[PDB]
Structure 1
Amino acid sequence: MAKADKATAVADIAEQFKASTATVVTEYRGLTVANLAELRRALGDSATYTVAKNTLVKRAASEAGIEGLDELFAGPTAIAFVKGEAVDAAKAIKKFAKDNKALVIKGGYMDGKALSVADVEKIADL
């Protein structure tokens, strides 16, 4: 991963996020690619599921209001963008979480605010 590649990865993540209404932070340690592929299938219809480096997102977060998620990057980082709709992936990630239980939703971000595990679960229902 060259320095130019590291920089352009920030730009694409920022470009992806800018049109993304909300973000969800989740933990993926211990999930096979096949099951991850089903989550990609459960999310790729409308949303976008990604895993990126902690500091790569950090620089890709200083632009917009995801500067407030710096404390949610401690540990494995899996981020879900919702370019289509708002809560569609929120149900899917919780349902996938209940299916595997090796996944922990670290937190979420929507409309300029950061929320905890219970709160994003509340917005998952709403």
Structure 2
Amino acid sequence: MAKADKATAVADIAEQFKASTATVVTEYRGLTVANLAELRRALGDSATYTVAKNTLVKRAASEAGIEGLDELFAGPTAIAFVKGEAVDAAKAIKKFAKDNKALVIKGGYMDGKALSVADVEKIADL
């Protein structure tokens, strides 16, 4: 661990958030590498799913276009990013969610808004 790598991860989060469009943040619980890798290779040939921090993501947020959130990452963080649109992969994480139920789908930053019953759930499932 190094603060140089902290700034590196902040820059990586900022630039990949700018490059890829959909960003589904998740609270990971009830996992296992053997199964998450297996499902991820299948559902993620156009996305990628991995960790985020509570403060490095906040720095990348202040330095990217997701500026004011600052309180969502109080908990485990296993963000995935879809470089097209999280519809197939969003449905994928939705079925994984209704399978395990330990994982929570925190939300995202599709465009301006963070999370609500209106857009994120329905664009994910349907």
- What TM-score comes out, normalization by structure 2 length? 0.87
Distance 1:56 1:114 in 2: 18
CA shift for structure 1 position 70:
2.1
Bigger share in helix: 1
Distance 1:35 1:56 in 2: 27
Q: Percent identity?
A: 100
Distance 2:86 2:21 in 1: 7
Change (3 A) 1:106 1:81: same
**2:27 touches 2:76 (CA, 8 Å); kept in 1?**
yes
Runs of 4+ in 1 over 6 A off after TM superposition: none
Bigger share in strand: 1
Change (3 A) 1:57 1:39: farther
Distance 1:90 1:13 in 2: 19
Distance 1:118 1:98 in 2: 19
- What TM-score comes out, normalization by structure 1 length? 0.87
- Give ranges in structure 2 of 5+ residues lacking alignment: none
Q: Once structures 1 and 2 are overlaid, which stretch shifts more, 36-45 or 76-85?
A: 36-45
Distance 1:69 1:39 in 2: 29
- Give ranges in structure 1 of 5+ residues lacking alignment: none
- Any idea what the Cα deviations from partners look like across 1:82-112, whole Å, max 9, x if unmatched? 1033422211110111121111111222022
- The aligned length equals 126
